[PDB]
Design a protein around this nucleic acid. Sequence first.
RNA 1: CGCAUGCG
RNA 2: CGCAUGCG
Lengths: 123, 123, 123, 123
Amino acid sequence: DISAKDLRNIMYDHLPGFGTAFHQLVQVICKLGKDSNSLDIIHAEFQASLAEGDSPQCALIQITKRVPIFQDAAPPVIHIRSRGDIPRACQKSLRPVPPSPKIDRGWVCVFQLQDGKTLGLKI
Amino acid sequence: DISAKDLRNIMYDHLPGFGTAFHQLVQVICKLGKDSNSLDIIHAEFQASLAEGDSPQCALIQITKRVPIFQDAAPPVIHIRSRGDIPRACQKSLRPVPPSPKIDRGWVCVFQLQDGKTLGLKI
Amino acid sequence: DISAKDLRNIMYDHLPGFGTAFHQLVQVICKLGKDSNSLDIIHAEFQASLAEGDSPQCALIQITKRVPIFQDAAPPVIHIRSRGDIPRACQKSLRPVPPSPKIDRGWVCVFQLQDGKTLGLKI
Amino acid sequence: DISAKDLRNIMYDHLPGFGTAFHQLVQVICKLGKDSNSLDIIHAEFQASLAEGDSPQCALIQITKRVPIFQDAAPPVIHIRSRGDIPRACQKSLRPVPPSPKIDRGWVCVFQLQDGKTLGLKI
RNA sequence: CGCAUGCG
RNA sequence: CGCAUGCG
Ligand SMILES: [Cl-]
Ligand SMILES: [Cl-]
Ligand SMILES: [Cl-]
Ligand SMILES: [Cl-]
Ligand SMILES: [Mg+2]
Ligand code: NA
Ligand code: NA
Ligand code: NA
Ligand code: NA
Ligand code: NA
Ligand code: NA
Ligand code: NA
Ligand code: NA
């Protein structure tokens, strides 16, 4: 068994840079994983992908496609006070949110400002 | 149900320029699509990607990543007489081939000259 | 011996466009070069890079990599009133600041608004 | 102590992709290193850089600026049959050689084709 | 500004 | 085509 915090840190230590869309995806993956008791399945898939020589980024995409909790799942809403609260290497990946975004199509999360404005983070 | 020619024309209508590396990708997509009877699935993915705000170029890339026939597929080899047979706008995207290229990693096709020399087309 | 104004004019005469990130880099280079009495050394590096085939943009970058005053240097903070004060052609190169930015890693300057919000200019 | 083969492989293992300008720089560094008996210092410098959190690419550039054999050193000439013999991710880094290329200014090597054409590899 | 790698 | 990272 692995905790959410421990798994996030393992995943973060494989990712280039900081505050990228993949860093946000790690947080999303680990929260949904925790809530669905999928953390060990997720961890196993991550390790196996690395073992096969896949990039960490590739491994995270594959998790959203292969682990059941993410299949046909909507991105979580993340409430923020301002655009400045969005991770610092994600700003160019924001788009208006479509009617039915799916995590397995690259919609990581939906940021929601205090006036209710939303911005979708897309890989 | 959609013709390969018709789907090609739809795709081309969305693309900037003429004879670009993405026009070459359209042709590869339509050939492999026709052969696998996947043209309707391909047309659906193209439209779904455009609908969620993807550029036409990105929508084509999404097809290679999401439609089963392109999964792990090696690029076709296209035999040519000279480098002049390659559309001029594709020339900036030409590069030597790797050991085991995959369409879903950006390798559209491999051009091969009479003397066996090759030039890969990478988006 | 060369003045900061003369060097800036030489550099500008090489650059395309108006109000680009590279124009701001010139201003940063000439200021820190004036302060450190490095203008002749900067000038020599600029000319030496051009002579070996670097673009003017690349030659300005080579100065930040090669001239001692720019080594690990933190970028200057420029106080502004609105994001509209930042030249239009620079807008594409703006992003949030990292923990400890350095000129020789591409951080030209940091624009700061009255309320303390910041925008880093990254080449 | 370390051998030239063991050092190359250590360095290669840290580099992204294959056949890049940095892969060629590894071969150059270990060749001139071996010939000048600088392998242990080169290894020491590479490890310290990585320990500081520098990228392997950064570490290799620092070697060319810090290790005496590379200071003001001419790039080696590599005799090849045709452009196809150049490493597969170096083609876009080739340019005409200036009068006096230096490794510490990023001139990794000069390829000499059988037809007489010279092409310098520039980082 | 450009190259390389990763990802879509 | 775009984004991210690294390098010049
Ligand atoms: Cl906003
Ligand atoms: Cl449709
Ligand atoms: Cl403003
Ligand atoms: Cl290693
Ligand atoms: Mg983050
Ligand atoms: Na990181
Ligand atoms: Na067109
Ligand atoms: Na091959
Ligand atoms: Na590698
Ligand atoms: Na280059
Ligand atoms: Na990278
Ligand atoms: Na790329
Ligand atoms: Na970059």
